[PDB]
């Protein structure tokens, strides 16, 4: 049974279907997991996400660079950022960002629409929990969404180091076809549902080890329909079990090699190292970020 895992990943056979998009109707819609006393939903959710990421071949260089979009909350604090800071090796550079002001444990925080955020440097891990509740409109067609998803797709293609990974939150209505297509540019990908939030259509789209080119062609409209079909036919039992064993939580500092290479030198042997979480390709200069400010 999956109840002792941190969550459930989309099985490979569902990825290979060619389903039409349906309404998401979750059997366990009204259930809630029993959280440990005084633990916030979003601390539990990010903890299970990080527990799952621990099982993948993430590149973890010295001086890791992580950026976290959608890090604010209606509480004015950043619970997910606190979990990421706990999970990541000490000394990891962590930047976070949100549309609205909030108090953060990140090394630097940028406030504004994500489209205003620019970074000189590339990143080893991108986390997004950006979400607009307005997208949940059951009275209109559930079409691919733009907005911040457009930004995220460009940010991945321009500012994610080869070998880097992403986890991007989606829901039944908050999704983008090009993001799914971009998952075919990673060595491996999945949609991961946390066990504490399994009564929601939320998942994290996870791309593991960025290759900078399509290794497989994914039709994003079909793959979102496949994701919904999986959720519609596979009730996931709500569970907080994995939150009680925190002894192996910290991300293992692997000291992954960082090299700068031109595009010409990305041969098949380099691709193989990227695909195994054994190489990051980017520069190692200073990390510089900014937010554009519109003046009247």
């Amino acid at each position: 049974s999956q109840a002792w895992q941190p969550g459930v990943a989309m099985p490979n056979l569902y990825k290979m279907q060619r389903m039409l998009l349906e309404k998401c109707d979750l059997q366990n819609y009204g259930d809630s997991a029993t959280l440990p006393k005084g633990i916030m939903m979003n601390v539990a959710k990010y903890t299970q996400l990080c527990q799952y990421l621990n099982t993948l071949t993430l590149a973890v260089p010295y001086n890791m660079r992580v950026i976290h979009f959608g890090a604010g909350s209606d509480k004015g604090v950043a619970p997910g950022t606190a979990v990421l800071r706990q999970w990541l090796p000490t000394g990891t550079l962590l930047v976070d960002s949100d549309l609205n002001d909030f108090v953060s444990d990140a090394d630097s925080t940028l406030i504004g629409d994500c489209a205003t955020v620019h970074t000189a440097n590339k990143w080893d891990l991108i986390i997004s929990d950006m979400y607009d509740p307005k997208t949940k409109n059951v009275t209109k067609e559930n079409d691919s969404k733009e907005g911040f998803f457009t930004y995220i797709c460009g940010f991945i293609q321009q500012k994610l180091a080869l070998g880097g990974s992403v986890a991007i939150k989606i829901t039944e209505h908050s999704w983008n076809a090009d993001l799914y297509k971009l998952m075919g540019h990673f060595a491996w990908w999945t949609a991961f549902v946390t066990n504490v939030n399994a009564s929601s259509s939320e998942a994290f789209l996870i791309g593991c080890n960025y290759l900078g080119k399509p290794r497989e062609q994914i039709d994003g409209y079909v793959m979102h329909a496949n994701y919904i079909f999986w959720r519609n036919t596979n009730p996931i039992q709500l569970s907080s079990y994995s939150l009680f064993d925190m002894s192996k939580f910290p991300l293992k500092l692997r000291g992954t090699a960082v090299m700068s290479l031109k595009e010409g030198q990305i041969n098949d042997m380099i691709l193989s190292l990227l695909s195994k979480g054994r190489l990051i390709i980017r520069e190692n200069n200073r990390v510089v970020i900014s937010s554009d400010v519109l003046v009247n």
Binding site: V43, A78, S104
Partner: protein, 114 residues
Amino acid sequence: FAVDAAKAYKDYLASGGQPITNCVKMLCTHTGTGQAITVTPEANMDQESFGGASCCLYCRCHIDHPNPKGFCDLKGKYVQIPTTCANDPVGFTLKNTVCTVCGMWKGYGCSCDQ
């Protein structure tokens, strides 16, 4: 003139005001060193660990930290709070002091005066 937020908060609590909420409590083993302020959660069996920025009165109230440099000693760190005090982490960190020798809270783990 300068606003005394520290005194204003202590005075508000004595009046029966509800402590600042939504301090970010972390999941951890509760088998840690028990030191007061650490780079990663270090609660022992008698403590809860919180994300540091969320328990800093100055961070939470959006006001300057009271030292000429404006540095924050909680932001980006984790603060261990005795479980019996964990309903008011902001007040606890405000009212108490860390021992510079062992790193425990004075009166809640520091035994340097034995």
